[PDB]
Design a binder for these strands. Sequence first.
RNA 1: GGCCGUGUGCCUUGCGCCGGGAAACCACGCAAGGGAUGGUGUCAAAUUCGGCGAAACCUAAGCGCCCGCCCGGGCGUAUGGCAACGCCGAGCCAAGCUUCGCAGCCAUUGCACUCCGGCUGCGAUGAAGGUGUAGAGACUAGACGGCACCCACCUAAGGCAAACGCUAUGGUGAAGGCAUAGUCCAGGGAGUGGCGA
Length: 95
Amino acid sequence: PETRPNHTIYINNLNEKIKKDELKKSLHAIFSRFGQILDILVSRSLKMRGQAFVIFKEVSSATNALRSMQGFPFYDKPMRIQYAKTDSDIIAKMK
RNA sequence: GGCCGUGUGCCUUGCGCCGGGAAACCACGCAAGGGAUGGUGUCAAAUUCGGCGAAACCUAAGCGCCCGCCCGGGCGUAUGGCAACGCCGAGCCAAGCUUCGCAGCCAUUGCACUCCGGCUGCGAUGAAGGUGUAGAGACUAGACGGCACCCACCUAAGGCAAACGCUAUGGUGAAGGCAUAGUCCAGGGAGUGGCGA
Ligand SMILES: [K+]
Ligand SMILES: [K+]
Ligand SMILES: [K+]
Ligand SMILES: [K+]
Ligand SMILES: [K+]
Ligand SMILES: [Mg+2]
Ligand SMILES: [Mg+2]
Ligand SMILES: [Mg+2]
Ligand SMILES: [Mg+2]
Ligand SMILES: [Mg+2]
Ligand SMILES: [Mg+2]
Ligand SMILES: [Mg+2]
Ligand SMILES: [Mg+2]
Ligand SMILES: [Mg+2]
Ligand SMILES: [Mg+2]
Ligand SMILES: [Mg+2]
Ligand SMILES: [Mg+2]
Ligand SMILES: [Mg+2]
């Protein structure tokens, strides 16, 4: 249902057809009114397909995205949203 | 269609040998013979532009030489030819591969930060191999070629085995297709004309 506070959020169960260059722009404008966004990682590989990571500036921007856009029908499919249990390599360089 | 020689290519044997390889066996340098060279299926495309190199054989202008000189001849001799054929640069190519773009189905609910599941469908791509390279040339199929597999034989590194050892993803089963089987038309047989010496 929910994991533990983190800047990055683990998203799965999505439409597995939209291209990498297209899906990055499909998440930019919709998930912007929560705060500053860092980077979005998308992979079409068998392990990572239908899965995406989204990183915000602060926890407040990440928690707002967790509640306001919870279970949004993204391309005819609702999305499962959890916090990333493992910290990203981007955040560790800043801390 | 058959004999007698010539050169070049080819394999076998016998011998050289800073080479690659674990070995088998490739690669080379040469010398002496023609006995020996698996199968089955599959692919039929690009076939273009230039350049380098060549023996046997054909020939003798220039040279030397001799007919005492000249006049004419005679001799040798490629730097002239033809050509088996050895390659090279660029473009291009059918399947089987190496890697990407898009579609389609079968899967998969998956926490990753460098990147990665299958199968058929074109399009693009690397590594072989081919074309270029036949008597001018043209078309047809095949194999002696490309690809996949099978068989025989050798070997045994890696893997397996406590171990005698076992096994190929390693090799070997010639070159021809610089036109091979064929059809076709060039060329000689069979004219005339140019160039050359
Ligand atoms: K002969
Ligand atoms: K050796
Ligand atoms: K050839
Ligand atoms: K062994
Ligand atoms: K020929
Ligand atoms: Mg024989
Ligand atoms: Mg044809
Ligand atoms: Mg004279
Ligand atoms: Mg005279
Ligand atoms: Mg002679
Ligand atoms: Mg000559
Ligand atoms: Mg040529
Ligand atoms: Mg031709
Ligand atoms: Mg042998
Ligand atoms: Mg040929
Ligand atoms: Mg020939
Ligand atoms: Mg022929
Ligand atoms: Mg004539």
